[PDB]
Design a protein around this ligand. Structure first.
Ligand SMILES: Nc1nc2c(ncn2[C@@H]2O[C@H](COP(=O)(O)OP(=O)(O)OP(=O)(O)O)[C@@H](O)[C@H]2O)c(=O)[nH]1
Ligand SMILES: [Mg+2]
Ligand SMILES: [Mg+2]
Ligand SMILES: [Mg+2]
Ligand SMILES: [Mg+2]
Ligand SMILES: [Mg+2]
Ligand SMILES: [Mg+2]
Ligand SMILES: [Mg+2]
Ligand SMILES: [Mg+2]
Ligand SMILES: [Mg+2]
Ligand SMILES: [Mg+2]
Ligand SMILES: [Mg+2]
Ligand SMILES: [Mg+2]
Ligand SMILES: [Mg+2]
Ligand SMILES: [Mg+2]
Ligand SMILES: [Mg+2]
Ligand SMILES: [Mg+2]
Ligand SMILES: [Mg+2]
Ligand SMILES: [Mg+2]
Lengths: 117, 45, 97, 189, 26, 41, 139, 176, 191
RNA sequence: GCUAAACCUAGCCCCAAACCCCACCUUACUACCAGACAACCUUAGCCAAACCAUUUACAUAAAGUAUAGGCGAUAGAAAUUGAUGGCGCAAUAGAUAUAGUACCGCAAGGGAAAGAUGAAAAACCAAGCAUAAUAUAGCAAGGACUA
RNA sequence: GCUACCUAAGAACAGCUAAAAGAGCACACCCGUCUAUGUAGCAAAAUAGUGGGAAGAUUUAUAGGUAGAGGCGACAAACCUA
RNA sequence: CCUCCGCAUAAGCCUGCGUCAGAUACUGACAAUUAACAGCCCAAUAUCUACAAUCAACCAACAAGUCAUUAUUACCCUCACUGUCAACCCAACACAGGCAUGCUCAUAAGGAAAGGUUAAAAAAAGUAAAAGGAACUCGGCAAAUCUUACCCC
C-alpha cells in the first residue's frame, strides 16, 4: 500500500527479496544446484601503487602561488604532444606520430570506453 | 464482516498496477501519461 | 472583527505622471487627422476585441473564431464548454421570452 | 565567525586601590590623547558622577550609556528597575582628587570622592523603602572611571567599597531569612 | 485584508472614543 | 473579491446598540438581536 | 568503483582492474560486543565483501581472514514539518575478521569568555538583609 | 595497517588540527598520470580517516576536530578526478572524435519524450536481445495530445514566472 | 536555502540562524534595491562615515558585509546594548551590539581627507578596476604559516612531472607498475 | 483578561509580445544471452423539440439572407467586400497548489490546510467564557416608573 | 488482494463407533439455527451461549483467468473492493 | 489468578517500548539484523519415462493418480548478491473482528478481569429457591432436563 517509499530487496516475498539486489556489480554466474561460480576476471582488481617515497601529502602548503585555471583541451594536448614531432618530420602515416586508426586491438579502448574510471 | 477487502501481497500489487503492466497496453500508457501531466510523485504502484 | 485595527498605509497617487498627463491624447486622431486612422486603432488589447463590444456569449464566440486555433488545449475546451452553456442560458432561460 | 564582539569596557578594575608610581600610566594616557590633565580630571569625574546619578533618577538610559561603562550600567539599573529613586547631590565636603591610574587598550582612573548626598527609593507603589528624601548623608567612595583608546570617553566603570566601609543605612522593612528547608529524612543541626 | 480606507478610519475614530471613555482625560 | 463590505461592523452596531439592554444572547448575536430589536421598535 | 559502467567480461577476457578506487569506507566503533579480531566498517552499498577484502589488503595491507556484510535499513519514520517522511540513508555494514591471530580494539578518540567568567565571579549575589534595595548606592 | 584509519595519536583529542590547502585543479594538471594515481590513494586514505573521525564524533556526540579538512580532501579528490577526466576526454577526442565516453543515442521513448538513451553492454545483437526488443522506443499517436498538454503546462509555468518577475521589477523601481 | 529566506545578522547556517528562521517560516521578503556586483563599493575593513541615526557623522571600520541585504556593519558604531549569558539567576553582562547599516546610510571616507566621498568605479590602465573619489579625485585603495606533516612543500606541489603523451592514466600506470596483460578484450555490442 | 482579533506579500488571473556520473519497459528506476509482437476503423449521450422516435449550434458586411428542416424545434452558407500593460485578486480571494505534497482509494482517481514582530533577535473589537449563578410571571420587550 | 466461478500446483482434517461410506458422535476448521446483549456498538454485522457440517459436492494458503451492452451464478435478480 | 494461548516459518508491514538527552508506546541523536537457514539455478541436440498413493505387505478398489533417463557433443580454472530488527499485518484506532502452516495439547511459553470507595433504583451475566410444574406465551422463546408418537414439504 506504500507507493512513496523506495522499492528495495527488503520488501516482497522470498522470491522478490532474493532476486532484487542493492547495486553490487555481479562477480560470476549460477550453475546447476544454485552453485555460484565466481569469475576472477570479473572481480575488480585494485591497482594500488607503491606509495613509498611519495612526496605529495594530501594537503598543499598555503604558501603556494596561485595560477589561472587552464582546462586541458584536445588542441593543447595535440600541441604539447604531437606538434613537435610533426614539425621535426615536416622540416625533415600518422601512426608514427601517434594516431591510432581504430580503438580495436587495444586493452584500453577510449571509445566505447572499456576500462574502469 | 466487511472492510478488510485489502489482503496485501506485493506479487499481486506489482502484477496488477505495476509499471510493466501499465506500459503493456496503450490505455495504461495513457494512465501513466495522465499521472505525469498531473505531476504525481508516484506514476505507478 | 472583519475590520482592520490600523489605518492602511497612505495611498499616494501622482495625478501628473506621464500616463495621466497624456491620457486621452490622439482620441480625435480621426477627425483632426483627415481620418487616416480611426480612433479604435488606438486600442491596445486582445486581438479579438479591439474596437468591438458584445455580451459574454458574443465575446466567447469571437475569441474562439479569431484565436481558437492558437488557444491552449484546456483553455479551448473551457471556452467550448462556456460557449455551450452561454448558448443554452441565453436561448432557453430568462424572465422574458 | 569572521566578526567578533567589539567590547567597549573591561571585566573589572586592573589594580584595586586598597584604601587606608603611576606616572607611567599617565604617560601612556597622554601619549594616546595629547590633551589630558590629571589635575583637571577630578572636576570632570565629579560632573560625570553627578550626571550619571541624575540620569538614574530620571531613568535616562541613553545618557547613562554615555556616562557609565557597560560593566557599570547593569549594576546601577538592574535592581532599580520598577522603582523610583530620588537621588540628589547636595555638596562635596572635601575636593575630589585622583588617587590611582593604570592602563584594545583601556585606562582606569580611581577618584576618591567624600561628598554628601540624599536618597529616597520607593516601591512600585510609591512606598518609601530606603533613606530620607531630604536628610543628607556623608558618603566616601572610590569611583573607578575607564576610557577606551577613537570616540571613547571617560565613564564610571566601578565603585571600590573599602572592607572597612561603615555599614550602609538600615532598611525600613523587616526581613525573614528561612532556615534549611529540611527534607523529611534530613534532621536539623 | 479588505481594500479600503474609510471603514478603517471610522473604526479608528470609534477606538479613540472607546479609549477616551475607558480612560477619560483630566 | 472585487468589492467587499467593510462597514459590516458599524452596520451590526447600529442594531446592537439598541439591544445592549436585552437578556441572553439577544443583546450579543445580531441574528437574534435584530429580530428582538425590530419587535421592540 | 561505483556509479561507473563495468566493462563487460567475456570468457577469456582480460582481468577487470580499477585504478582510482571510488569506494570510501568508514571504520566504526561496534555498537555491541564483538570478538577481538573483528573490525566493523560502514561501506558503500555497491561494494561486495570480496571488494572490501581486496580494498583492505591492497590499500591498507591489512591481512583479512573473513568478511561478512549486512544492509542496515535506515529509518523512514521521521517526518518534517510538511509531514513528508525523512529517509535516513540505508548503509552496508561489513564485519572483517583479521588473519594471523591479529587483534584490533577501537581507539579511544577524544581523550570574551574570560570577561564572562570574571563577571560571574564578581556576581556579588544580593544579600537577604538588603531586602531588595539596590546595592550600588553608598548611602 | 588499521592505524591508517585514524589520525595521529598525538592529534587524537586535539580541538583543532591545522591542515594545508586543498589541491587545485591547475596544480594537479602539472602532475604525471602516475603521480596523480598515487595522490589519489593518498587522498583516499586521508578521506577514510576523516570519515572515520566524523562518524566517531557523531557516536561520541562531540564536534569533529577541524571539520573543514574533510571538505578540503573531497575538493582535492574532485579536482584530481576532473584533471584525469579532462586528459581522458582530450585523448578520446583526438583519437576518435567522440565527445562522450559511453555510446548513446537520442531516442523517443514510449511517452514521446526525447531522451538520451545510454547504450548498455550485451553479448548478443540487439535484434536477438529479447528484453531490449520488449523495450519500446517509439510513441504512438495517442501520445501527441499529452505532449501538447505538457508543452502548454510548461508554457504556463514560464509565463507565470516571467510575469511575476516583471511585476517584482516594477515594484522595485517604484520603491526606488 | 529556503525561498525568500530572510538574511539576518547571524550567518545563514548558525544555530541562532536556524532558531530564527526554521524551515517553515514564511515572513514577508525584505525589499532591497538591486545593487549590481560591479557597483558595490563597500568592503570589509573600509573606513566609512555614518550619515543617519545615532552616531551620525562618526567614522568607523566596516566589520561585516551582508551583501544579500545591502548591509555594512560598522565596528563599535550604531550600537544598542544587549545582555549576554543571562541565566535564570544571573542578570548577564551588558555588551554593545552593532546594528546593520544600509550602504545608502553609509558613505566611504577619503584615505587622507578623512571626509565622506562619492565613489566611481573608474578603470585605470594599471589598476584595471579601482575606486576613485569624485569630489576630490584620488583612488581609495581596497583594504585587506608553517607546513604541517600532511602539507606538500611548495616545490613538490609545483613540480611539473607531467610529460604530455597520447596515453591514458590506466595504460600509463600499467606500464609504470609492470602489470602485463595479454588477453585481448573481446568486442561487445552496445545498444 | 483569556480565547482570540486584526496585518501585506507569498503568489496568482487576464492580455500583449515572443514559438517551445550511474539506474530505469523484468516486479521501472534492476550491469551482462537466440528475438520475431506490434499502430491506424463514423463518437456517443445528455439536452431542445416543453414526451420522443427524423432532427438539436461546437475582422466587418453580404446575413441571420439564399437554403435546410417530424418545413418545427432549430440549423444556415456562398458569390462578393476588405483586414503595450491592468477602473485584476490580496491568504475562505487569486492557480488545487506552501502541493498534485499530506491524506484518502486496490486502481483509475479524489485531494487539503496554512504565514504574518522588528532596521536590527549578534536587541482597546466577533462568538465563547471570567471578572460577576440565581427570586413568583411567562417570544422576555414596550409604555413606564423614584425604583 | 473482497466476492461468484474456474486454472496450476500445495496444505489441513484429533479422538471414538463403524468399515473402502457425499456413514454416526465429536475437536481443530468452516458455517451461522435460535436466544440475549450491542444498535455512533469491541464491531459500517460483533460478543456470549446455543447450534449445522466437520474424509468431502469439504475447508484453506499461494499465483493466474473471466469486466460492466459485461463477467460469474447448485437463479438468491446472488456476487463482481463496505 | 488467567492461559483463548504461546514459540517459530510464511505472508504483510518497514525500525514502529534498544541506549542516551529533552520533553511532556512522544521528539532528536546514537546503535543494530553478520549465513550454514531461505531466495537467487541448470549448455545443446535428439532420445527415454504402461505398472499410483494409502507403514505397500496381504486384500480392496475407483474418482485412475506429485515425483525416473539415456546417446553424443561442450565444460572448472574461481563460495558472490539479497531477507535476517520489533510489542508488527488487513480492519480510519493499543479495534472483543479477519489472519496459512510446524510444534507445544497446557505449557518451561505468554498474560492481568478489580483507578479508589459505596453496595440505591433500572439494566446486563450468573447462581439458589418453598409448593405447583407450561397454568407463561403466538409458540416450551429462554432455562432446565435427555426425553414418546403422529403429520405436511
Ligand atoms: N501587455 C503586456 N505588456 C507587457 C508584458 N510584459 C512586458 N510587457 C511590455 O513589454 C515592454 C518591454 O518590457 P521590458 O521588460 O521593459 O523590456 P524587454 O525585456 O526588452 O521586453 P520584451 O522584449 O517584451 O521581453 C513594456 O512596454 C512592457 O510593459 C505583458 O505581460 N503584457
Ligand atoms: Mg484471500
Ligand atoms: Mg426533450
Ligand atoms: Mg423545460
Ligand atoms: Mg465569403
Ligand atoms: Mg487558496
Ligand atoms: Mg465578546
Ligand atoms: Mg477424523
Ligand atoms: Mg460424514
Ligand atoms: Mg427466483
Ligand atoms: Mg424476485
Ligand atoms: Mg546475508
Ligand atoms: Mg485491569
Ligand atoms: Mg470502578
Ligand atoms: Mg422452584
Ligand atoms: Mg397455554
Ligand atoms: Mg407436557
Ligand atoms: Mg394465558
Ligand atoms: Mg430451546
Amino acid at each position: 500500500a506504500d507507493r512513496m517509499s523506495k522499492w528495495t530487496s527488503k520488501r516482497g516475498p522470498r522470491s522478490f527479496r532474493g532476486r532484487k539486489g542493492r547495486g553490487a556489480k555481479g562477480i560470476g554466474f549460477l550453475t546447476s544446484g544454485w552453485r555460484f561460480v565466481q569469475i576472477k576476471e570479473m572481480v575488480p582488481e585494485f591497482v594500488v601503487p607503491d606509495l613509498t617515497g611519495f612526496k605529495l601529502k594530501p594537503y598543499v602548503s598555503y604558501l603556494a602561488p596561485e595560477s589561472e585555471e587552464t582546462p586541458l583541451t584536445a588542441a593543447q594536448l595535440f600541441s604539447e604532444a604531437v606538434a613537435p614531432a610533426i614539425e621535426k618530420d615536416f622540416k625533415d602515416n600518422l601512426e608514427k606520430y601517434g594516431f591510432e586508426p581504430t580503438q580495436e586491438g587495444k586493452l584500453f579502448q577510449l571509445y566505447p570506453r572499456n576500462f574502469l574510471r | 464482516a466487511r472492510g478488510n477487502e485489502y489482503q496485501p501481497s506485493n506479487i499481486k500489487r506489482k502484477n496488477k498496477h505495476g509499471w510493466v503492466r501499465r506500459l503493456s497496453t496503450p490505455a495504461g500508457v495513457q494512465v501513466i501519461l495522465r499521472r505525469m501531466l498531473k505531476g504525481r510523485k508516484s506514476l505507478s504502484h | 472583527i472583519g475590520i482592520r485595527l490600523t489605518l492602511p498605509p497612505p495611498k499616494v497617487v501622482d495625478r501628473w505622471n506621464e500616463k495621466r498627463a497624456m491620457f486621452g491624447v490622439y482620441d480625435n486622431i480621426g477627425i483632426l487627422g483627415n481620418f487616416e486612422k480611426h480612433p479604435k486603432e488606438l486600442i491596445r488589447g486582445p486581438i479579438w476585441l479591439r474596437g468591438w463590444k458584445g455580451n459574454e456569449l458574443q465575446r466567447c464566440i469571437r475569441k474562439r473564431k479569431m484565436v481558437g486555433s492558437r488557444m491552449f488545449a484546456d483553455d479551448l475546451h473551457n471556452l467550448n464548454k462556456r460557449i455551450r452553456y452561454l448558448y443554452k442560458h441565453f436561448n432557453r432561460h430568462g424572465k422574458f421570452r | 565567525s569572521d566578526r567578533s564582539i567589539h567590547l567597549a569596557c573591561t571585566a573589572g578594575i586592573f589594580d584595586a586601590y586598597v584604601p587606608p608610581a603611576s606616572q607611567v600610566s599617565i604617560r601612556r594616557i597622554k601619549d594616546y590623547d595629547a590633551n589630558f590633565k590629571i589635575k583637571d580630571f577630578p572636576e570632570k569625574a565629579k560632573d560625570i558622577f553627578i550626571e550619571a546619578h541624575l540620569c538614574l533618577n530620571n531613568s535616562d538610559h541613553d545618557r547613562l550609556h554615555t556616562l557609565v561603562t557597560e560593566h557599570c550600567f547593569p549594576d546601577m539599573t538592574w535592581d532599580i528597575k520598577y522603582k523610583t529613586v530620588r537621588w540628589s547631590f547636595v555638596e562635596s565636603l572635601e575636593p575630589s582628587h585622583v588617587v590611582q591610574v593604570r592602563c584594545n587598550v583601556y585606562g582606569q582612573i580611581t577618584v576618591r570622592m567624600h561628598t554628601r548626598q540624599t536618597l529616597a527609593i520607593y516601591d512600585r507603589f510609591g512606598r518609601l523603602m530606603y533613606g530620607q528624601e531630604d536628610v543628607p548623608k556623608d558618603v566616601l567612595e572610590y569611583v573607578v572611571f575607564e576610557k577606551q583608546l577613537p570616540y571613547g570617553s571617560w565613564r564610571m566603570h566601578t565603585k571600590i567599597v573599602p572592607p572597612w566601609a561603615p555599614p550602609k543605612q538600615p532598611i525600613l522593612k523587616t526581613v525573614m531569612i528561612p532556615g534549611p528547608q529540611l527534607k523529611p529524612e534530613e534532621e536539623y543541626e | 485584508v479588505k481594500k479600503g480606507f474609510r471603514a478603517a478610519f471610522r473604526f479608528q475614530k470609534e477606538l479613540e472614543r472607546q479609549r477616551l471613555l475607558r480612560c477619560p482625560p483630566p | 473579491l472585487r468589492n467587499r463590505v467593510t462597514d459590516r461592523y458599524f452596520r451590526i452596531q447600529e442594531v446592537l446598540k439598541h439591544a445592549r439592554h436585552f437578556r441572553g444572547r439577544k443583546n450579543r448575536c445580531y441574528r437574534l438581536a435584530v429580530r428582538t430589536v425590530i419587535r421592540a421598535f | 568503483a561505483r556509479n561507473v559502467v563495468y566493462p563487460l567480461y567475456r570468457l577469456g577476457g582480460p582481468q577487470l582492474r580499477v585504478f582510482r578506487t571510488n569506494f570510501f569506507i568508514q571504520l566504526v566503533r561496534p555498537g555491541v560486543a564483538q570478538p577481538e579480531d573483528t573490525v566493523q566498517f560502514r561501506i558503500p552499498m555497491e561494494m561486495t565483501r570480496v571488494d572490501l577484502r581486496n580494498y583492505l589488503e591492497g590499500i591498507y595491507n591489512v591481512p583479512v581472514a573473513a568478511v561478512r556484510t549486512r544492509v542496515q535499513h535506515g529509518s523512514n519514520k521521521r517526518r518534517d514539518h510538511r509531514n513528508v517522511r525523512i529517509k535516513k540513508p540505508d548503509y552496508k555494514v561489513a564485519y572483517v575478521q583479521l588473519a594471523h591471530g591479529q587483534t584490533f580494539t577501537f581507539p579511544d578518540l577524544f581523550p570574551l569568555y574570560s570577561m564572562l567568567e570574571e563577571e560571574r565571579q564578581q556576581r556579588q549575589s544580593s544579600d537577604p538583609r538588603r531586602g531588595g534595595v539596590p546595592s550600588w548606592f553608598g548611602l | 595497517g588499521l592505524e591508517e584509519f585514524f589520525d595521529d595519536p598525538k592529534n587524537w583529542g586535539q580541538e583543532k588540527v591545522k591542515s594545508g590547502a586543498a589541491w587545485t585543479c591547475q596544480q594537479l594538471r602539472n602532475k604525471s598520470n602516475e603521480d596523480l594515481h598515487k595522490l589519489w590513494y593518498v587522498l583516499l586514505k586521508e578521506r577514510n580517516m576523516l570519515l572515520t573521525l566524523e562518524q566517531e564524533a557523531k557516536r561520541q556526540r562531540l564536534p569533529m576536530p577541524s571539520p573543514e579538512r574533510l571538505d578540503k580532501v573531497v575538493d582535492s579528490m574532485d579536482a584530481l578526478d576532473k584533471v584525469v577526466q579532462e586528459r581522458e576526454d582530450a585523448l578520446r577526442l583526438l583519437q576518435t572524435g567522440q565527445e562522450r565516453a559511453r555510446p548513446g543515442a537520442w531516442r523517443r521513448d514510449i511517452f514521446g519524450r526525447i531522451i538520451w538513451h545510454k547504450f548498455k553492454q550485451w553479448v548478443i545483437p540487439w535484434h536477438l536481445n529479447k528484453r531490449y526488443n520488449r523495450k519500446r522506443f517509439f510513441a504512438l499517436p495517442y501520445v501527441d495530445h499529452f505532449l501538447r498538454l505538457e508543452r502548454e503546462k510548461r508554457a504556463r509555468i514560464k509565463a507565470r514566472k516571467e510575469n511575476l518577475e516583471r511585476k517584482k521589477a516594477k515594484i522595485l523601481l517604484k520603491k526606488f | 536555502l529556503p525561498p525568500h529566506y530572510r538574511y539576518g545578522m547571524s550567518p545563514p547556517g548558525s544555530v541562532a540562524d536556524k532558531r530564527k528562521n526554521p524551515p517553515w517560516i514564511r515572513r514577508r521578503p525584505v525589499v532591497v534595491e538591486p545593487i549590481s556586483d560591479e557597483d558595490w563599493y563597500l568592503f570589509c575593513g573600509d573606513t566609512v562615515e555614518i550619515l543617519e541615526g545615532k552616531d551620525a557623522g562618526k567614522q568607523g571600520k566596516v566589520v561585516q558585509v551582508i551583501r544579500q541585504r545591502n548591509w555594512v556593519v560598522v565596528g563599535g558604531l550604531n550600537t544598542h546594548y544587549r545582555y549576554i549569558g543571562k541565566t535564570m539567576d544571573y542578570r548577564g553582562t551588558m555588551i554593545p551590539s552593532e546594528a546593520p547599516l544600509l550602504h545608502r546610510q553609509v558613505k566611504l571616507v577619503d584615505p587622507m581627507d578623512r571626509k565622506p566621498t562619492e565613489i566611481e568605479w573608474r578603470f585605470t590602465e594599471a589598476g584595471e578596476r579601482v575606486r576613485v573619489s569624485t569630489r576630490s579625485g584620488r583612488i581609495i585603495p581596497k583594504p585587506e604559516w608553517i607546513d604541517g606533516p600532511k602539507d606538500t612543500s611548495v616545490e613538490d606541489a609545483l613540480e611539473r612531472t607531467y610529460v604530455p603523451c597520447l596515453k591514458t592514466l590506466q595504460e600509463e600506470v600499467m606500464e609504470a607498475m609492470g602489470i602485463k596483460e595479454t588477453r585481448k578484450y573481446k568486442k561487445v555490442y552496445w545498444y
